[PDB]
Design an enzyme around this catalytic site. Structure first.
Site, PDB file in Angstrom:
ATOM      1  N   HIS A   1       0.833  -1.203   0.000  1.00  0.00           N
ATOM      2  CA  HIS A   1       0.000   0.000   0.000  1.00  0.00           C
ATOM      3  C   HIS A   1       0.866   1.249   0.000  1.00  0.00           C
ATOM      4  O   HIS A   1       2.076   1.181   0.184  1.00  0.00           O
ATOM      5  CB  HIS A   1      -0.902   0.018   1.247  1.00  0.00           C
ATOM      6  CG  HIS A   1      -0.135   0.174   2.529  1.00  0.00           C
ATOM      7  ND1 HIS A   1       0.520  -0.874   3.136  1.00  0.00           N
ATOM      8  CD2 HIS A   1       0.122   1.266   3.288  1.00  0.00           C
ATOM      9  CE1 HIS A   1       1.129  -0.443   4.225  1.00  0.00           C
ATOM     10  NE2 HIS A   1       0.908   0.854   4.337  1.00  0.00           N
TER      11      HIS A   1
ATOM     12  N   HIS B   1       5.427   6.366  -1.084  1.00  0.00           N
ATOM     13  CA  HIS B   1       6.185   5.193  -1.508  1.00  0.00           C
ATOM     14  C   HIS B   1       5.413   3.963  -1.108  1.00  0.00           C
ATOM     15  O   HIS B   1       4.544   4.018  -0.227  1.00  0.00           O
ATOM     16  CB  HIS B   1       7.567   5.171  -0.837  1.00  0.00           C
ATOM     17  CG  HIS B   1       7.505   5.002   0.645  1.00  0.00           C
ATOM     18  ND1 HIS B   1       7.149   6.030   1.493  1.00  0.00           N
ATOM     19  CD2 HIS B   1       7.728   3.922   1.432  1.00  0.00           C
ATOM     20  CE1 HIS B   1       7.164   5.590   2.739  1.00  0.00           C
ATOM     21  NE2 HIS B   1       7.507   4.315   2.729  1.00  0.00           N
TER      22      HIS B   1
END
EC number: 3.1.4.58
Length: 171
Positions: free
Chosen positions: A40, A120
């Protein structure tokens, strides 16, 4: 009282390509792989949050009126200090930065300590040695339609993420 965060998810198709790529380019010793379903992109980490504060932050998140946006993963790298290898974007979409900034500001206003946002997707943890970083695979690109509030728990030896609420982006 739970450990909460808001995040953006990846379509199953993209998650599958990311783990095939990860297996192809990093040997087992390169680090501990994040489970595919756990991949995620965190927007804002809230830390431990009371039921009352959760309700308040959720109400604030419901004020957000952010258009859908496309996310194209063109970058990868390693941060040795936190010992992670991640996927990212050279130029994150304006919509992503705007959404994250809103949620982090709402969190900050509500006494959830923050800090700068570096979007990220972590692929490996406990990556303590510098490894060769290839470019990501081709065409890892998808429409973001919503964001989600997750509770994070840890047992046993494993991190588990439970979705609590989702909010659609506009289009």
């Amino acid at each position: 009282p739970q450990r909460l965060f808001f995040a953006i998810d990846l379509p199953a198709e993209i998650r599958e390509q990311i783990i095939h790529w990860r297996a192809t380019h990093f040997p087992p010793e390169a680090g501990r792989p994040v489970a595919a379903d756990n991949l995620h992109l965190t927007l804002a980490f809230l830390g431990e949050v009371s039921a009352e504060k959760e309700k308040a932050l959720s109400l604030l998140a419901g004020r957000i009126r952010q258009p859908g946006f496309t996310l194209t993963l063109d970058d990868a790298g390693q941060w040795l200090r936190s010992r992670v290898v991640w996927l990212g974007m050279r130029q994150p979409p304006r919509g992503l930065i705007q959404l994250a900034n809103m949620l982090r500001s709402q969190a900050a206003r509500s006494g959830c300590f923050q800090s700068p946002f570096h979007p990220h997707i972590t692929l490996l943890r406990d990556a303590s040695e510098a490894v060769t970083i290839p470019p990501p695979g081709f065409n890892w690109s998808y429409a973001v339609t919503e964001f989600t509030l997750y509770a994070s728990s840890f047992a046993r030896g494993r991190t588990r993420y439970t979705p609590l609420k989702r909010w659609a982006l506009t289009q």
